[PDB]
Design a protein around this ligand. Structure first.
Ligand SMILES: *[C@@H]1O[C@H](CO)[C@@H](O)[C@H](O)[C@H]1NC(C)=O
Lengths: 46, 50
């Protein structure tokens, strides 16, 4: 299970900019488990 | 107390294996690097000469 990512600033927050940039690898997982669905985690003060 | 009745501490280690890549691997020997001569080399599984 491999992850690739990169970071870049934005001043046109409304939509994705044009251009081209590549993603670099940073970490790998030897987990070997099966993945079929995924979700996201959020945070909020209350 | 008797020798047969003396307390003993015992440590047991067990094995399990999976089709996932192995994670516990002990070290291997390694030598020093040499320059400017014809030599066989093995780097992390990559093999060659020069
Ligand atoms: C993952 O799915 C395969 C078939 O797609 C199955 O053979 C296997 O048992 C499942 N689980 C793991 C841990 O690979």
């Amino acid at each position: 299970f491999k992850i690739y990512s990169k970071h870049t600033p934005i001043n046109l927050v409304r939509d994705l900019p044009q251009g081209f940039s590549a993603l670099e690898p940073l970490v790998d997982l030897p987990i070997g488990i099966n993945i079929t669905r995924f979700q996201t985690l959020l945070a909020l003060h209350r | 107390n008797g020798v047969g009745y003396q307390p003993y501490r015992v440590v047991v280690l067990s094995f399990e294996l999976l089709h996932a890549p192995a994670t516990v691997c002990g070290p291997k020997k390694s030598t020093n690097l040499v320059k400017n001569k014809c030599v066989n080399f093995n780097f992390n599984g990559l093999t060659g000469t020069g």
